[PDB]
Ligand SMILES: Cc1ncc(COP(=O)(O)O)c(CN)c1O
C-alpha cells in the first residue's frame with residue numbers, strides 16, 4: 211500500500227492541494243460564475259446536426275490551427291468591440307486556463323516573473339507557479355480597486371516580465387479604466403495580459419481598442435465560459451498582434467483543441483446575439499441582489515460583472531458553510547471577511563437572498 | 575499599428591529559432607502520415623454520439639465534471655478487458671490526448687533540475703515535451719536494427735540516474751515491440767519513474783505493461799491513447815494506467831476542468847462501441863504485413879513492425895523521396911531520420927496506391 215509520499219514527486223508539489231471549488235450537488239449553485247441559463251434550443255439543435263455531420267471524421271486528427279474557429283472568433287470580436295481583427299489576431303485553447311498556461315510558457319517561465327494585483331483570479335498565481343514563473347503580488351487598495359500609485363511604482367521597481375490586469379476583476383467586480391490600463395502598459399517592460407473573462411458584462415470598451423497602440427506588449431484574454439454560456443465547451447481565446455500567435459504555436463500541444471471543441475464553439479458563436487441577450491437579464495438581477503444585500507446590512511463592493519463580492523464576516527468560511535447548510539453554494543475566495551456570489555436566475559437569487567437574510571442575524 | 579514580428583516580442587530565449595511541430599496539412603487524397611485508423615467511426619457509434627450530445631448539450635453552460643469519473647470508470651473497464659489486468663477509476667487518468675498526459679507527468683515528475691531518458695529514434699514529442707516542461711532530455715541510441723540495445727540502455731540508466739525513462743512499445747517510428755522482460759530490466763535500474771508509451775499497443779498481440787503495475791507501483795506509468803487503433807484521434811483522448819498515487823500526483827498539475835463535457839461524453843460513447851471499432855485492428859495488421867512484404871519484394875529496406883505503420887529506406891535524400899510520394903497523391907511521414915520514411919497503413923485501396931507509388935519511386939533512386 212503506497213501513497214503520494216512514496217512517489218518521486220517534485221519537492222515544490224509536496225503539501226499542495228488540487229485546485230477547484232467543491233463539486234457539491236446542492237439545489238442552488240452560485241459559485242463558479244457560470245451563466246445560469248441553459249444553452250438555447252436553437253443552439254442545441256444546430257450542435258446536434260453539426261456533430262451528426264462531422265462525427266464520421268472523428269478518426270482523423272482535428273484541424274491543428276483551428277482556422278475556422280479563429281475566423282468566427284475574430285468576427286465576434288470585430289462586432290462586439292468594434293476593432294477590426296482577423297484569424298491572424300486570434301488564438302484558441304481549452305479554456306482561458308490553457309490560454310494563460312501557453313502565454314506563461316512562452317513569456318514567463320524559469321528566471322521570469324509575473325505581477326498581479328491581489329485579490330484577483332486565483333489561477334493567475336497558480337498558473338505562474340505551475341509554469342515556474344515567480345508571482346509578484348501587489349495589493350489592491352482598501353476599496354479593492356487597483357491603487358495606481360502603488361501599481362506603477364512596483365512595476366517600475368520590479369520590471370516584471372508579465373503583468374496581469376483582470377477587468378472586470380474576479381473576485382471584486384471592478385473595472386480598471388482603459389486610461390489606467392494604458393498607464394500600466396507604458397511602465398510594463400514585457401507583456402501585459404488583460405484578462406477580460408467578464409468583459410461582456412461591462413458596457414465600457416474592451417482593451418482590444420488598445421492593441422493597435424501597444425502591439426509588442428498587449429494580449430487580451432477572453433473566454434466563452436461566462437457571459438457566453440459555454441463553460442462546458444472549455445474555450446478560451448486571446449486577441450493580439452499576429453506575432454503572439456507565432457509565439458504560442460511554439461509551446462502549444464499539437465492538436466490541443468479537439469474536433470468537437472472547435473465545431474461546438476463555432477456553433478455557439480453563430481448564436482451569439484441570442485445567447486448574449488442573457489447579459490441584460492443578469493445585469494438587472496445583479497442590481498437587485500446588490501441592493502437587497504445592502505438593505506439587509508451587508509457591505510457590498512460595487513460590481514460590473516456577473517457576481518457580487520460582499521462582507522463583512524468574522525469568519526467567512528463559517529458564513530459560507532451557513533449558506534451551504536441552507537442549500538446555497540457560493541464561493542469562499544480565501545479573502546478575510548468576504549464571499550463571492552454569482553448572479554443566477556431570479557429563483558436562485560431569491561434563495562440566496564433568503565439565506566443571506568437569515569445569516570446576517572447569526573453575526574458570523 | 576507599428577509593423578512587428580515575433581522578433582519584437584519578449585519571447586523566452588530558448589524558443590528563438592524553434593518551429594511549430596506537426597506534419598504539413600496538405601490536402602492530398604491519400605493521407606498515410608499520422609498513424610490514424612483509416613476507417614470512419616461506425617454508423618452505430620455516430621448515432622449514439624448524436625443522441626448523447628442532444629441529451630448533454632443542455633448542460634454546456636456548466637463547467638464539466640472536473641475529475642472525469644465516469645470516463646475513468648469506462649477506461650478502466652476497457653483496460654481490464656483488453657489487458658486482463660483488473661483496474662478501476664482509481665488507476666486511470668485522462669487528458670486531451672497522450673500529449674497532455676505526457677505533459678502532466680513531466681510537470682509532476684520531471685521539470686527544472688530533472689532529466690528524462692529516451693531511446694532514439696522514438697516519438698518526436700517526448701524530447702519536445704521534455705524541453706517544454708524544462709526537463710533535460712537524454713537521448714540513448716537504439717541499435718543498428720533500430721531496437722533498444724539493452725546493454726547500452728541499462729548502462730546509461732545506471733550512469734545517469736534519470737528521473738524519467740520513456741519506453742515506447744510498439745515504437746514510433748520503427749514499429750518494434752520491447753519485450754516485457756526488457757521493460758522489467760529497464761524499470762529495475764530506473765530510480766524515478768518509467769513511462770511505457772503504449773500508444774500502439776492494440777496493434778500488437780503481445781502483453782501490455784499494465785501486467786507489470788502490481789510489481790512496480792512506485793515506478794511504472796502506462797500511457798495509452800484513443801487516437802490510433804481506437805479510431806478517435808479527433809476526440810483528443812489520452813490516458814494512463816498506474817497506481818492511484820499517480821492520479822494524486824497529476825491532480826496537482828492538471829489544469830482544472832481540462833477535459834470538456836463533450837470530450838468526456840464522446841469518449842464514453844466510443845468506449846461502449848470498442849469491440850466493434852477495434853475489429854478493424856485485424857484487417858490493419860494483415861494489410862501491414864502485405865505492405866511490408868511488397869516493399870521488401872520491391873527492394874526497400876523495411877524494419878519489422880508490430881504497429882499500424884512501416885518504417886522503410888534507404889534513400890539518399892528521404893525528403894526528395896517524400897516529395898515523390900506527395901507528387902503521386904500519397905502523403906506519408908518524414909520523421910527526420912536520414913534515409914527513411916514512415917507510412918501509415920490505410921484501407922486496402924490506399925495501401926495499393928502507396929505501393930504503386932513506391933514501385934515507381936524505387937526506380938528513381940532518390
Ligand atoms: C478572471 C478569470 N479569467 C479566467 C477564468 C477561467 O475561465 P475558463 O473557463 O475560460 O478557463 C476565470 C474563471 N473561471 C476568471 O475568473
Ligand SMILES: Cc1ncc(COP(=O)(O)O)c(CN)c1O
Pocket residue numbers: 608609670671672673674697742745746771773774798799800801807811812
Ligand atoms: C508513441 C506516441 N505516443 C503518443 C502519441 C500522441 O497521441 P495522442 O493523439 O494521444 O496525443 C503518438 C502520436 N503520434 C505516438 O506515436
